[PDB]
């Protein structure tokens, strides 16, 4: 009756087979190959702090017409160069080149967000403070 | 169902329920056993013998009028061959196929058949080998078999 | 299907096929219950007084309704020959 062995001694084949096939799991493979630590701009860690190289004006994908304000960031522990979105209305006004920023993921498991092409990170903080506070008014940008 | 093809074909002797008798059969174990020897005394196979006894004589099953299987009778009188009968005819067959192949190398059908025949030969030997009727490390070889059957 | 203390619980104890003893459920609108009338001396057929049988929609779909009935009524007494238990 189709498939798999049934027998009482066929434990090994049953484990091996599973082992072999577990590899078709997209997440398992990433874990065991250590893809994270190897590819992927962050270490495999949740956030990464980097430095702002240029400010970009990414044009959004269809069916959306817009200009998504972004930044090129060179992760400090890394040299890895990355582009990141600057969330909310204005906020790009807060950043400036050579400034220090804190990058996070986009909540999509790698993968880019919406109509923003090739962007897999967003900012979060600048010069030690946080976009959110700045955008509101709770905090002010530091001197230099 | 069928070892080396996909034939199904259920087809055999349907042996009688009555394990003894036939009771219209006179004669005696005494008698047909002598008649078993004198036949395999002339050189015939045990199966050859049972046929010859079944048709011309009253021997319905040799195993019944006599207490034992024909081959065992043969053994007991020391008439058993070097190797089992079924094995012999397998070997003897592979000899004839090989001969025909050495003469017709373009005959891939024969080559395929040779494989089959030999694979039955070897699996059978491994059974015999297992149950001590052939020596441990007995073995079928093309080179030596042609000599072996005759 | 009784309860804690002897009391009968759970409505409706269903009919069954006289032939298979499977439950005959509500939506089984293909099942059938034959009423066969008892008769008295000089052929009178006694109204409202039956020997009765019930056959599941299953059995009838499978075409076994006639043969099944044959047996049933006969080893009860309404038939004499017709059905054989051997084949």
């Amino acid at each position: 009756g189709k498939g798999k062995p049934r027998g009482l001694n066929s434990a090994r084949k049953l484990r091996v087979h599973r082992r072999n096939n577990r590899w078709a799991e997209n997440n398992y493979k990433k874990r065991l190959l250590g893809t994270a630590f190897k590819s992927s701009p962050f270490g495999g860690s949740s956030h990464a702090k980097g430095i702002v190289l240029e400010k970009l004006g990414i044009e959004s994908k269809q069916p959306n017409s817009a200009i998504r304000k972004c930044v090129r960031v060179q992760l400090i522990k890394n040299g890895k160069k990355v582009t990141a979105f600057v969330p909310n209305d204005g906020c790009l006004n807060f950043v400036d080149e050579n400034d220090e920023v804190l990058l996070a993921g986009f909540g999509r498991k790698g993968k880019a967000k919406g109509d923003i092409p090739g962007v897999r990170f967003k900012v979060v903080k600048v010069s030690g403070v946080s976009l959110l506070a700045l955008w509101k008014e709770k905090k002010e940008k530091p001197r230099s | 169902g069928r070892m080396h093809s996909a034939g199904k074909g259920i087809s055999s002797s349907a042996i009688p329920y009555s394990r003894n008798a036939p009771a219209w059969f006179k004669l005696s174990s005494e008698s047909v056993i002598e008649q078993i020897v004198k036949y395999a005394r002339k050189g015939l196979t045990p199966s050859q013998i049972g046929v010859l006894l079944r048709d011309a004589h009253g021997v319905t099953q040799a195993r019944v009028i006599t207490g034992n299987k024909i081959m065992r009778i043969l053994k007991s009188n020391g008439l058993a061959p070097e190797i089992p009968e079924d094995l012999y005819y397998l070997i003897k067959k592979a000899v004839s196929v090989r001969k025909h192949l050495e003469r017709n190398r373009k005959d891939k059908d024969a080559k395929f058949r040779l494989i089959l025949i030999e694979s039955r030969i070897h699996r059978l030997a491994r059974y015999y080998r297992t149950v001590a009727v052939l020596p441990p490390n007995w073995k079928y070889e093309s080179a030596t078999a042609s000599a072996l059957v005759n | 299907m009784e309860n804690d203390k002897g009391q009968l619980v759970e409505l409706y104890v269903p009919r069954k096929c006289s032939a298979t003893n499977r439950i005959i459920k509500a939506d089984d609108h293909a099942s059938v219950q034959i009423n066969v009338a008892k008769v008295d001396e000089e052929g009178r057929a006694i109204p409202g007084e039956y020997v009765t049988y019930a056959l599941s929609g299953y059995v009838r779909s499978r075409g076994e309704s006639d043969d099944s009935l044959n047996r049933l009524a006969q080893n009860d007494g309404l038939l004499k020959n017709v059905w054989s238990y051997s084949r």
Binding site: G7, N9, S10, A11, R12, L14, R15 | G78, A132, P135 | -
Partner: protein, 155 residues
């Protein structure tokens, strides 16, 4: 293993402190010592009748059997005076609720009191380390020959 010679080493092979006084004329040339290993293992007669030396012999030598008792099935008798048995064993795996065949080879000493061949089932008894790999010493043969003589010529 041994066989023949017995006095075939560079050092003279002898049982320690088992003196035979040359002054006292004896009728058996050499006084021989043995014990019984205990656990109701019969010290076989070839151990006493024998003249082999083996200081790793359970019955005539300076080892003791203590610890484990193992019965394996002998898979190699190429090393002089030691064998390798395959311990026959079988092993459970919970997730699948079935088992899987496993084996372990064990090296064991074998006194010239025993005459083992490949295929024999053999009961071994633990002893002190005896060599780099051997922690076991034969002690008893549960087999014989495994139907060898029952394979001779034709009728």
């Amino acid at each position: 293993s041994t066989e023949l010679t017995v006095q075939s080493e560079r050092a003279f092979q002898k049982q320690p402190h088992i003196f035979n006084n040359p002054k006292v004329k004896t009728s058996k040339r050499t006084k021989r010592w043995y014990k019984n290993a205990g656990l109701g293992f019969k010290t076989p007669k070839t151990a006493i009748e024998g003249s082999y030396i083996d200081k790793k012999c359970p019955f005539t030598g300076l080892v003791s059997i203590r610890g484990k008792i193992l019965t394996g099935t002998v898979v190699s008798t190429k090393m002089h005076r030691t064998i390798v048995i395959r311990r026959a064993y079988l092993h459970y795996i919970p997730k699948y609720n079935r088992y899987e065949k496993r084996h372990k080879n064990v090296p064991v000493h074998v006194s010239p009191a025993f005459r083992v061949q490949v295929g024999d089932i053999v009961t071994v008894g633990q002893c002190r380390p005896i060599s780099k790999t051997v922690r076991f010493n034969v002690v008893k043969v549960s087999a014989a020959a495994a139907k060898a003589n029952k394979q001779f010529a034709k009728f």
